[PDB]
Symmetry: D2
Subunit: 338 residues, 4 copies
């Protein structure tokens, strides 16, 4: 009785999901990747599965054939279909659910192509509009029903923010808040200054030698995940020169007067596999490979009070790649309970 996963797009997230699923399969969870769909040569995909500059070397023998990646002598078929309804992984490989990572299928309407191939459910690894559910595991996975065939995982930043916001909202109420995520550079940024698809003047700039402000949607979209905070949050990002590892700061007005210790005790109550409480004075390197969606840092909590007014700053780390990945894998497991 294994949940069988097809990965559409073997990019950074897809590969890490492959690694994560194999690790959980070793710890007896009933889940496996059975097939991949990607237009890149399998040899190149195998090599990128094996060697990662951020996440280390995969501790398994990895090779390839003409049409597969091989891991510890087991074949994983790599199809090369630009159109999802033509991937035969349901009948050939037993795919139940698809992790949709390509960027080309980021809406309810587009990803229905997988359902035409006999796929039961699709989890899109990106925000995908508001005519489907956006799920942050540990916050709102219980809103999923048998009828939810296409689901968004939101963004990496939504999965960092929502657990912290959820705890604050339940314990104190949030009236209004603004986020800044100090964030690792990502693969679509430019290595040196040059024209970028879309024409954005900041996306065009050398990523590993600049602090670069960037627009985000995770705070304005919080209402998709926690409806009672719809329209109460906003934010942005600063892209900085680390290759992975990010931190989300939230400054809030709460419905109640608090102390920093009180805030921190409240976060500790919501500790779970998706929401870690990390008091050991860590830096971004220490966060790489963490499996929680959001790693709350009580050492950075600050309450600033003047007269009757109070501002509350709460800070969560995340591995913008692996935290997000592991949140998605938990959501894929949750699909089997539907």
């Amino acid at each position: 009785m294994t949940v069988k996963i097809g990965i559409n797009g073997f990019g950074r997230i897809g590969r890490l999901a492959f690694r994560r699923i194999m690790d959980l399969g070793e710890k007896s969870k009933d889940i496996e990747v059975v097939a991949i769909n990607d237009l890149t040569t399998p040899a190149l995909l195998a090599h990128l599965l094996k060697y990662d500059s951020t996440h280390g070397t995969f501790d398994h023998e990895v090779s390839s054939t003409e049409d597969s990646i091989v891991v510890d002598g087991k074949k994983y078929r790599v199809y090369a279909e630009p159109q999802a309804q033509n991937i035969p992984w349901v009948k050939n490989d037993g795919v139940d659910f698809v992790l949709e990572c390509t960027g080309f299928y980021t809406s309810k309407a587009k990803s229905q192509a997988h359902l035409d191939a006999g796929v039961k459910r699709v989890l899109i690894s990106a925000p995908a509009g508001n005519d489907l559910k956006t799920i942050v595991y540990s916050v709102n996975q219980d809103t999923l029903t048998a009828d939810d065939k296409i689901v968004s995982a939101g963004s990496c930043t939504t999965n960092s923010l929502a657990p912290m916001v959820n705890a604050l909202q339940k314990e104190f109420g949030i009236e209004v808040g603004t986020m800044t995520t100090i964030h690792a550079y990502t693969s679509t940024q430019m290595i040196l200054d040059g024209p970028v698809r879309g024409g954005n003047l900041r996306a065009a700039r050398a990523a590993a030698i600049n602090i670069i402000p960037h627009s985000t949607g995770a705070a304005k979209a919080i209402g998709l995940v926690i409806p009672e905070l719809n329209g109460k949050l906003n934010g942005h990002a600063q892209r900085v020169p680390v290759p992975d590892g990010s931190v989300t700061e939230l400054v809030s007005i709460l419905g109640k007067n608090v102390t920093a210790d009180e805030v921190n005790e409240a976060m500790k109550k919501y500790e779970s596999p998706s929401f870690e409480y990390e008091p050991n004075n860590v830096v971004s390197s220490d966060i790489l490979g963490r499996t929680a969606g959001s790693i709350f840092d009580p050492t950075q909590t600050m309450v600033t009070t003047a007269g009757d007014k109070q501002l509350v700053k709460t800070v969560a780390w995340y591995d913008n790649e692996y935290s997000f990945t592991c949140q998605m894998v938990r959501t894929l497991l949750h699909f089997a309970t539907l």
Copy 2:
């Protein structure tokens, strides 16, 4: 009638002040460096004056003798006195004011040693307590009198924050606010993880491969510069891997309801050599070599409103090295009007 400057400590800031003063001397301002005091070999100091990895090569011939740096054939004496009262630069070189950059003289009581050597006034390049004035040029230099012999320039971060806070306070009122400065790594951080003087667990970590949270004093000390905001601000920093170039975010509750455009127009009114208005979608690299203390970025201004509550985010860039340096040089010029 030149203001003659002695520099105590030819560290990064001292050297950049030397460069800045020479540049202003070329543009006819009546100011010059006449002498330096530093325990390092002059040859090494000359080389670091000439070549800088962040600020480029100084466009002048630079060499040294046993006891001097030579710039374009002119000698600048390098004394090597661990005790300031023994530096003979007043009688030998005509020093009026001292730029105190060593870290060993960061109080009113310690820097009085310069006054024992016949120095008229001392500007300390760091926060130096509250029994002397902390001056951010363009904000409170007019509080200086003839009696102010020892003065603090505050920190680099205070000089980024105070012009923006000053404008907001005059136009709207600030009730409470919290800062985060996303900040370049500095010379006292560790290149690789290892023990650091003091034992701080975060200061110990590799600086160019981590986002590292850091305590700051610039927001809590704002009352020294703008007394009516005493106790109303707090903040911290995130040290990230750029060698220079920083940005200060302030989230405020204002005494009045506003729009982002209204906030930005208000900042534009206070534009000056110390406070630049920069709407051209810049990144940190573009800020290197800027001469303003604070470079307001209207593209990052955000007003988040929910019900009757409003949070206002305002963002200022700064060259944490050169912005600070140039603010200090303006303050040294102001000393001649006392």
Copy 3:
């Protein structure tokens, strides 16, 4: 009286050539850029001309129209023709010579399209086969004749290597040699690990956090520039995490017994605007903005001798972007003597 230049492809090199030509135009040189051809929106191109993370801010007012870049109120037409024979810059703008920077026209046969548009000569900013001349200014520009309509500048690395090799060959003879260039990352490298066009396993890897070995052609192609060394050199590169600034090491067997001092004096004899002699203990940052093709470093010269055998290591810095650019601009000036 002015040599008028059209730039095809306004990429990093094209933009730097624009800057370099404007700087030389300010110093009296009879040369100007009159038009550009590029498919990118002019506004984006103008912004990247103005702001560069490596080379600083261009000290001119820069804006754009729908079809031009504007610099200090002067219009520079941006055409958007995918086929070079359709660019009307000869009749409209008086283009004499084209700097060909697109990558799409890197052969004698392809770049002839410019000649069909009435262009007198084309300099290709890349190695372009062996049925045309490859010119490294200061080494073999005097092989050009009136009949040379299409010319290669070689690569950035050829321009760093050839001056040094030339001096060694004339003074001592080279019998055999091998190069390693420790080289800045470039715009076609990946920011994070992922599939790359071509499938190269190393080109796929995160560029700013790895030392990455890379195949080069500059040593094996030296026979195009210095025919007597055809087949005597080979080499490779190590790509490292600096955004610009590179160094070329050559290990040689020379036809004569030498000392390090003798080698260094020999290089000093060939000093010129294209070949600088730099004894001041510089590092890569100091090399950024240098205008020579090759900056010889006598502090790194080593001769290792055992019995009758001798190995000679000679080292030249270069700004892999701007050194190359300025070499090309000197070659465009040389075209006017044909």
Copy 4:
């Protein structure tokens, strides 16, 4: 039955040796660390043992007392004696051998102080002159006898170079050769440009934004390890912006005519735990955590031939921290056979 180790100096290498020894202890090896001597607060040392920005988080519970580090509930005494003869770890903790990592004891005469404390043998983690043996495990450990009480491990670079040189010398003969190691920055380099202890103009420069040439001793000292190559090698380094991971290139004249394939097969014959053969197109990140002293890369081997002359370039990766550490640990194990 266990070889008991005392570590003098719990710096980057000492801590990694602690990790390595604990890992080998888990795999049955009869070796353990029993005590440390270091002047730093144990709490700080414990934190740096646990969290490393390069080598990841140590997978053990780590805490401290006033005088110990605690790992998985087991106490490791931290003494704080500036003089080695006063450390009581022989009688208190059963120390057999000392790993000497402080820098203060880098000669035969100085480290004899440990022998006065009842220590059987000392391995110094650095080159330590020529009146003691310099041992590179897998090359010359069999020259050790019962009389060798104080031993040098050489440098990190000697351990990368010697295995490769050894194989070349045995199979082909080396007549002369020159090394360049493209090398990670180290803890004694400057984060930003400033004066450095010793006055070196290059050591003074910002390490994570420059290629910096650096003098080395590993090639000139090869005669200590392989006497027949005394005086036949020389070399230097280029420090580049990676925090760990290095590569050593050797260009040689061999006593015999060869092909690249022949060279690579010859290296494969000497493969061992100290000397790995790595054909999988790796980059420096993939080398982090490797346990071999030298990781030969056959993809970079080049033979350049012209007439009767031949240059042979061979390339070995190394984790300049952990490769060196693991070599030292193999040598400490070898001490038990004496």
